[PDB]
Design a protein around this nucleic acid. Structure first.
Lengths: 122, 114, 120, 56, 209
RNA sequence: CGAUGUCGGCUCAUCACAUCCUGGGGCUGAAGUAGGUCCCAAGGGUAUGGCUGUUCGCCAUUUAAAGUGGUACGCGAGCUGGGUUUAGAACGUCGUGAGACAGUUCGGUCCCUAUCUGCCGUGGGCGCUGGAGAACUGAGGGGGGCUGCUCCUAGUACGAGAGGACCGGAGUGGACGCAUCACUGGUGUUCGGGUUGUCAUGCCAAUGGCACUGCCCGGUAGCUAAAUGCGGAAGAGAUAAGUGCUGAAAGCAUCUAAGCACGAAACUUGCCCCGAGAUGAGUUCUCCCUGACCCUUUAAGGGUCCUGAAGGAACGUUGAAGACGACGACGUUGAUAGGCCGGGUGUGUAAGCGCAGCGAUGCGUUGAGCUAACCGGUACUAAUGAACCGUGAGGCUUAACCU
RNA sequence: AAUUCCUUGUCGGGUAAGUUCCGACCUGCACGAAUGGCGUAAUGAUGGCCAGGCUGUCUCCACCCGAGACUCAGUGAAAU
RNA sequence: ACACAGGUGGUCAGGUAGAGAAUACCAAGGCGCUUGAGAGAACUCGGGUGAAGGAACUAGGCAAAAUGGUGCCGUAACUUC
RNA sequence: AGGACCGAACCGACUAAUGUUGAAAAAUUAGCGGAUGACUUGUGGCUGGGGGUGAAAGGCCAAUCAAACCGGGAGAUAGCU
């Protein structure tokens, strides 16, 4: 499950492709991540003109997990791989202009309505 | 145990169309999301059905659109608008656990040829 | 502990357990009397008592039956020839146990097996 | 380990006094003869509790 | 104020048309028929004795039938005594069933500890365990010392001991009540409760909200 | 020097304090955000990685705190053995040289059947001076106490801008102690199937074993988190500090002397939990036993024949209770357990047969046959009847009762 | 550096962080040509460092088939 | 030391699978051990099967596991050739 | 053609569990280095304690090693427990 050194995919365009977890970012003696949860991230695979540098340390929000979400009743819902969206370290919100897949409706519930306000359908 | 099965006679339902693992059931569903209660569809094959009575999951998976797209319809709970048993499989390993290792034409089930 | 296990242990491996009763069931049909310890005497009955009802019940592959378990072809020299329906007509209770215990200078739970009807 | 000389008989007998709990029950009369027999065990005639168990 | 005795008969999910399955414990009560009220000069306290099972007449003795003689003997599976208020109550013509909570939403459970043979440490108190690779001689399942090294004195009582399970209360301080049905002796409490199908199980009014 | 196994960590706690966070407040170069500091005070709490034996120090990113000490420089009949400190090898400096070097590098086999004390569970015995049986009271002594994020108060006071509140209220997650298999997964050699080699099988078929369950698929019942939940509350009482009111010493002034009301994570209850070897060995309810004779420097005992109540106890038939004992069910006035009948499940549609193919091998009969734990009917089988244990109203004091 | 005590030598690369690795410099207390010099193919129970495979060592351990331990009958010790 | 779980030169080399005295199932032939009945607790030891992560453990992937056969296709730098 | 090279026996005793009044004066278990050679092994013999024998370890030399076993000199000698 998502912890120290875990590699995640980027669900947004032209910033980065693959990025690494360094904190689950929730206080002391903490574990795991879920939909709409913040994570402390490092850039490991960059884009030739992308506006986030290789080896730099930033924040992201998680949008897909293979362990999935158990909050619904009866159905346990899992998602494609382990994917996140990059966050602006000085102006808040996501930095991408396009985001892949339809995503969950739970991404509105705190700070991340920008994600479903773009091309996603749920 | 029979003492809670005497209560299960006030929880389960017996009247169902005949279908087994590897069949298509093409259900119409709401998912209970959005104010206008928009009727939607589910696509895929049955991966679990019977024989736990009340606790028989009735699980369906899309299998041709990548990871996820899997839901539990509980056999008896009123959550479906229509159910249509269309395409028939042919199963001798009916758990369908090879669908966790195969993709495409190798994950497609024998055509029930006579 | 033993939170569901109700199967009888005998010391030694399970294939020895099954082989000892596969032999001693042949001895029981051959001599029609056997005396031995209670764990052996009771577990010997397993998969061979259901062959008494196999004289009366409607069946399929009747000669592959009584040979997929115990796997003996000398018990059928007497079973279904001089032993079957005259005990199925009683429904259960085909054999005695006569538990009396002990051996000469030694404690072991001895039982004395025979049919519920035996000429003297 | 250490043990001084020998265990006192006053404590050793006090540890023997629960070691087997052997009791007198006078035995019961057999249900076919004028003589006593061991509980749930066969008699010298090859009998038990009103029936024959072995041949003589 | 008083409690009720009523066995668990199994576990299930009760369902709603509102789209929640709701896990529950199933209980079936056979009522507790009352054998003594304690009042007037009874050593400075007031109480009620209920009895839950049933005992056969060829097993009941003359002094055992004498313990219930204020209303008559049925006995079986336990006694159970609860503290009572002033009110000058009769013992005869009384009986308690699930209607004791037919308007109460919050309950306190006392299930009693269950058989686990040796029980020991790992299956008892969730103590830590060690892998079998290289060294670690006979020290794979150790209690991290029960006491401490010499200077601070004798064994402290902060760490619990290893041993058999039984006679402990095993409380669950607050559960939700989903259904009561007085003329079916039916009770459905939310989620799981301590004990098993042979266990006897008590429910009492909650002291927390 | 007739031994005490010396580093640090791993693992796990307690006590002391000038309190890091938590509970209560004050002062400020305290708008706010904060930062700083002093008392009342030691109950609940008090970093994850990279380099380092680390002692230290450096670095990356976090927090309700990244507070201080004691403890054989805390834990070798616990874990580790990088360091200390031997035995092998070699290099550098010092000596003509063996040799020396907290010199340097890679390092280097390590004991055992807790006799005694303590502790859980539980037998045997002592105990209430008659026995037996079923239950409760609980004197008293412990446990457990800590939080972010979110929404609302509120982007309101304050503040180029950015930033931003204390008093309170609610929702939900983590940490921590337990619980449970309903749900979700793993397992599952007591159940079905596929399959390499070979044997058994008279031969072939279709079938059962063996080779590490041969290997590989499926798995009922049980068990268990990766699965799912409950819980550490607020009030009440009496107080320190502190807030004070009224009022002297000190015509004033003063929270203190008299008078007198408040008030904290501390104290004590409340929540949770044990407990009558509580020798302070308790009381609640109840059952049952009520004969002569011989003798004495005898109010103490022996000798003879009698004693059978209440209630226990050995062996059965047994149980997801259990190391042996203990403990639940049952014991013909019977369903305790096996067998039988049926309900229940798992596996994958066989055998044979007929159809299609040269054939491997399919398809129709066929969700075929074979098949674990659930739990109703059925005395078919099996629980020996007598017997065995246990005793005769129990010394003294006293209110009362019967006579 | 098998050589540098005095320091984790430094710059480049490797990682978010590199007392360790590779490359480069001379910025050697006492290196250097038989107390031998420079370097390489083959060989290895191979020192170390980078990346991958795959994994119950670890996240977090869970269940399982036997043999002792445990009970009785037989025989039957020691350090102290 | 012992009616010892060890060691000891030579000859034979059966059926099937296999390259094979690797290894397994069967012949000729030998054997089921000169103390047993059990009980179904940890703990200890030999051995198995594992979801989704992954070296994160530790001095160190030790230990364990995927790996592993040869038919054709394919194969860098370096070199004392 | 070959101190090539995989793999048993065969020669070893490197890894980890285990033993160290043991199955044993060093092997019980699975791996590991070498495996027609600077190989191993059955029989017979040769080299002898200031003397042997070592691809030579302060290794080994019949329980004995910076120097084996025995009796005698011998009741060496001890500013000492």
């Amino acid at each position: 499950m998502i912890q120290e050194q875990t590699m995640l995919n980027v669900a947004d365009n032209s910033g980065a492709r693959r990025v690494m977890c360094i904190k689950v970012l929730g206080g002391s003696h903490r574990r795991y991540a879920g939909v709409g949860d913040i994570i402390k991230i490092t850039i490991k695979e960059a884009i030739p003109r992308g506006k986030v540098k290789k080896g730099d340390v930033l924040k992201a929000v998680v949008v897909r997990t293979k362990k999935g979400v158990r909050r619904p009743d009866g159905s346990v819902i899992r998602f494609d791989g382990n994917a996140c969206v990059l966050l602006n370290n000085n102006s808040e919100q996501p930095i991408g202009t396009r985001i892949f897949g339809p995503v969950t409706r739970e991404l509105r519930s705190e700070k991340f309505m920008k994600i479903i306000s773009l091309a996603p359908e749920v | 145990s029979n003492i809670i099965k005497q209560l299960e006679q006030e929880q389960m339902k017996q009247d169902v169309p005949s279908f087994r693992p590897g069949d298509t059931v093409e259900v119409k569903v709401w998912v209970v999301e959005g104010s206008k209660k928009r009727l939607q569809a589910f696509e895929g094959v049955v991966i679990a059905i019977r024989n736990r009575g009340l606790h028989s999951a009735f699980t369906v998976r899309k299998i041709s659109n990548g990871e996820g797209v899997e839901r539990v319809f509980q056999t008896h709970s009123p959550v479906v608008d229509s159910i249509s048993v269309k395409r028939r499989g042919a199963v001798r390993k009916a758990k369908l656990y090879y669908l966790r290792e195969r993709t495409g034409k190798a994950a497609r089930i024998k055509e029930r040829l006579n | 502990m033993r939170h569901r296990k109700s199967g009888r242990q005998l010391n030694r491996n399970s294939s020895h357990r099954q082989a000892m009763f596969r032999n001693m069931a042949g001895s029981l049909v051959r001599h029609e009397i056997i005396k031995t310890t209670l764990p052996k005497a009771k577990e010997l009955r397993r998969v061979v008592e259901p062959l008494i009802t196999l004289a009366k019940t409607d069946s399929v592959a009747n000669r592959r039956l009584a040979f997929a378990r115990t796997r003996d072809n000398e018990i059928v020299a007497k079973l279904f020839n001089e032993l079957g329906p005259r005990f199925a007509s009683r429904a259960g209770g085909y054999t005695r146990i006569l538990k009396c215990g002990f051996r000469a200078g030694d404690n072991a739970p001895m039982a004395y097996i025979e049919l519920v009807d035996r000429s003297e | 380990a250490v043990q001084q000389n020998k265990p006192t008989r006053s404590k050793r007998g006090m540890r023997r006094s629960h070691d087997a709990l052997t009791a007198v029950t006078s035995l019961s009369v057999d249900k076919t003869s004028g003589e006593k027999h061991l509980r749930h065990h066969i008699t010298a005639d090859g009998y038990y509790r009103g029936r024959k168990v072995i041949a003589k | 104020m008083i409690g009720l005795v009523g066995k668990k008969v199994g576990m299930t999910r009760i369902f709603t048309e509102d789209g929640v399955s709701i896990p529950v414990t199933v209980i079936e009560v056979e009522a507790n028929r009352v054998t003594q009220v304690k009042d007037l000069a009874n050593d400075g306290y007031r109480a009620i004795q209920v009895t839950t099972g049933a005992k056969k007449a060829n097993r009941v003795t003359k002094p055992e039938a004498g313990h219930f003689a204020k209303a008559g003997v049925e006995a079986g599976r336990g006694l159970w005594e609860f503290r009572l208020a002033e009110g000058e109550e009769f013992t005869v013509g009384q009986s308690i069933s699930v209607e004791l909570f037919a308007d109460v939403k919050k309950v306190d459970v006392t299930g009693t500890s269950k058989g686990k043979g040796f029980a020991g440490t790992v299956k008892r108190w969730n103590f830590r365990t060690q892998d079998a690779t290289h060294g670690n001689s006979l020290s794979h399942r150790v209690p991290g010392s029960i006491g401490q090294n010499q200077t601070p004195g004798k064994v402290f009582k902060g760490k619990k001991m290893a041993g058999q399970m039984g006679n402990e209360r095993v409380t669950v301080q607050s559960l939700d009540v989903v259904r009561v049905d007085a003329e079916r002796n039916l009770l459905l409490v939310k989620g799981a409760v301590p004990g098993a199908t042979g266990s006897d199980l008590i429910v009492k009014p909650a002291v927390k909200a």
